[PDB]
Design a protein around this ligand. Sequence first.
Ligand code: CLA
Ligand code: CLA
Ligand code: XAT
Ligand code: LUT
Lengths: 68, 42, 197, 193, 73, 156
Amino acid sequence: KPPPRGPKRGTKVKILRRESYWYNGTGSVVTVDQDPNTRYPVVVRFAKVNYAGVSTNNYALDEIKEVA
Amino acid sequence: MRDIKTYLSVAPVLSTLWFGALAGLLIEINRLFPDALSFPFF
Amino acid sequence: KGSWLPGLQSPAYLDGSLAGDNGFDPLALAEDPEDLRWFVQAELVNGRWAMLGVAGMLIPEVLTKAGLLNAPEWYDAGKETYFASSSTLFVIEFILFHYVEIRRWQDIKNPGSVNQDPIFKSYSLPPHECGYPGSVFNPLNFAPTLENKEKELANGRLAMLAFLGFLVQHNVTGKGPFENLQQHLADPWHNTIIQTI
Amino acid sequence: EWFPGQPRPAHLDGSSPGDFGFDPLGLATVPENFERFKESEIYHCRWAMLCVPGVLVPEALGLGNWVKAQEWAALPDGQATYLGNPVPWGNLPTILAIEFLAIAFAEQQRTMEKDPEKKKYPGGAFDPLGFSKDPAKFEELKLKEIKNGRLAMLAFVGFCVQQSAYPGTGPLENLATHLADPWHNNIGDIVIP
Amino acid sequence: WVTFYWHWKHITLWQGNVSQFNESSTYLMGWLRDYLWLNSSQLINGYNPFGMNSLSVWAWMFLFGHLVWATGF
Amino acid sequence: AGLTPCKESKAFAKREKQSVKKLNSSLKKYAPDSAPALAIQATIDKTKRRFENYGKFGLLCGSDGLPHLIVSGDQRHWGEFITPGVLFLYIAGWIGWVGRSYLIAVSGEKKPAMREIIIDVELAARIIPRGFIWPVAAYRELINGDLVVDDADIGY
Ligand code: CLA
Ligand code: CLA
Ligand SMILES: CC(/C=C/C=C(C)/C=C/[C@@]12O[C@]1(C)C[C@@H](O)CC2(C)C)=C\C=C\C=C(C)\C=C\C=C(C)\C=C\[C@@]12O[C@]1(C)C[C@@H](O)CC2(C)C
Ligand SMILES: CC1=C[C@H](O)CC(C)(C)[C@H]1/C=C/C(C)=C/C=C/C(C)=C/C=C/C=C(C)/C=C/C=C(C)/C=C/C1=C(C)C[C@H](O)CC1(C)C
């Protein structure tokens, strides 16, 4: 009943953060932790792997655009 | 069988055969038109 | 309709609504509808002017070789001396065509816009179908029906082909194509593309 | 409209004499630029309109070439001529000085006044008879001036290109020559391509 | 590169044989032969087991270059 | 700039003479029928007819006996740059467009890398001959703005 933040599922997101490899990038939400003590509760998978070999990381909601 | 087809579609062998064919075409043109410097058609 | 390949399925691009459909696009050029329209108009104009040109090639040649007339070859008519010099008639052609063709293009971009002769307000135009203009073009009240558009397009395609043939055969020979036909009828085996190389 | 079918861009809704909707480079998107262009257009057309007969009139009647009317300046002892009248002070320095002083002084005192309508259309003491009587007639003659002046500017472009392609000639001269024989005395000899 | 071009052009013009430049300056081997090989023959014989010359310093200095450079590697 | 065609110059004739002369002098060290000597005479007549062909197509010719291209734009000497230039431009546009179209097509799969290393030779064969469209097709693309992108940079 308390409205869970973050997009629902599968919503392609456009990254607003500047200091990530995927600035102006199109990723996919995989889950969002409903805990209001988090500081980066959304997590996004991509189809392009970055330099460190990783393909996932965290964000807040402000650095997201729920594109579709 | 299909395995050898997918293997043959791997870029090395495809590239080798393509380049061989292109080089053959070029050397045959050079044979049939020695030294071919200008465009003496128009 | 008549898929020119008794086994191949026609692509969705050429359904059969437009005249002369045979699914003849083995390279999938016009798979975008607006480009299909573009090439429809281009084929129309190319075929019409190709019919014109092939007539202007063939008929003068035979009427001259018949002794009834005397007129140079279509290629031998340039250097001929007329009442007007080349450049004069050429620039008149240029201005008149830069009027007519630009009006045609404006009609292409905008269906039913440039209709009236903007000089006088009556006498102007009945609304048309794109690629098939109205009254002042079809005075004999011919009904623009099927088997007319198909015949037009088929004759025009063959005319394009025949014109390219004229051009390349003049390139390889420089002679009158009807003379090539006479030599052909002499001996089709001794007279063909093979011997002339 | 000047072009049928091509819709008029936003900032050309008629609303001004001469506006037949022609702006393919979109320079008029700026209001100040637009008014400045109108003013400069009026200046241009008005100058050229005054200054075409200053070429025609001499070229035909008792004068000579429109290029030799200034030939006095190329050589030292040149003195201008009024149809066959070398005025005592028609020398180079005095006309140069009056040009400088009059043009600069006046066009300053006139431009420095920002109505802004008076700039394009002075009036004032240049309308005491009231040829501004009829507002309909007003806009009509405005349109007329714009069109005639556009034509005059075209005419000057023609003068330039013609005197270029024909070194040392006269407009009326080339016109009479070409008309004298239609299909071989024209732009053709100039431009095959 | 720029100084190579200028120096070869002038060293041909001064001997009045710009023709040689114009002929054999279009193929790299021409540069390595007509410009470097030949024009260096006065230098590398600066000092030989038969004595020395005024050019000695340069020859010496020349080799010096082809050493310090190598040390950079 | 004074470059006479070697249909008329002399140093060209001198080069030709010296070349055929050294070739002929080399030729007289075998049997007059030996296949190597035969190929030598073949190359002799071949370079001869080369000199002849060069003396047939308006080749302005240097002060030292060498051809020299004239790429100044005048189509009088165009059989060197203009027509071969546009021909190669046609070929390059062919290749660029066919590659771009293949990639744009195959982008829609699970991991397009597997088809970028191992080409879809069937799709490759039914995409490849489209070269005859590369001028016009791309044209319409730019008309419809479907050739470039505005603010999509990373990811896709
Ligand atoms: C309307 C079409 C048409 C017609 C009637 C002709 C007719 C003729 N051509 Mg020709 N030609 C054409 C198109 C055509 N051509 C085209 C498009 C080209 C460019 C590829 C050529 C290139 C060409 C050359 C280079 C030569 C001829 C020659 C000839 C003549 C001898 C035939 C020959 O050597 O084979 C013709 C050779 C071709 C390559 C023609 C191919 C045409 C294609 C396949 C379409 C035609 C199919 C058509 C349905 C079948 C014929 C229709 C007819 C029975 C009504 C003959 C009068 C020769 C000549 O003048 O010597 C006497 C010759 O040297 N043609
Ligand atoms: C068809 C594919 C294709 C296309 C359309 C382009 C297009 C472009 N490249 Mg390019 N490139 C390609 C493949 C391609 N490239 C490949 C495979 C490589 C790695 C070798 C490069 C390496 C490369 C560099 C290093 C640079 C460009 C640049 C450019 C731009 C300017 C053109 C240029 O300088 O190229 C020059 C030509 C080449 C580099 C040759 C590469 C073309 C290859 C050989 C074709 C590949 C075809 C395909 C693999 C074979 C399969 C065929 C089919 C059956 C699937 C232009 C947007 C430049 C740029 O940034 O411009 C702003 C630049 O600096 N490219
Ligand atoms: C052949 C032709 C076009 C052929 C194109 C074809 C077949 C394309 C086929 C394809 O695209 C499809 C269908 C589907 C794709 O998947 C496959 C391919 C194969 C890619 C156009 C010719 C077009 C030919 C034309 C338009 C000729 C016009 C001739 C004129 C006007 C003659 C003028 C003169 O004769 C006069 C009038 C007087 C004389 O004195 C002087 C002159 C000037 C010589
Ligand atoms: C009288 C006389 C005689 C004596 O003896 C001598 C003398 C002295 C020489 C004389 C004269 C003088 C004078 C006054 C002069 C002047 C003139 C002028 C002003 C001109 C202008 C002139 C001018 C002109 C034309 C102008 C033009 C312009 C134009 C086209 C433009 C256009 C455009 C526009 C709009 C816009 C769009 O978007 C674009 C464009 C397209 C860009």
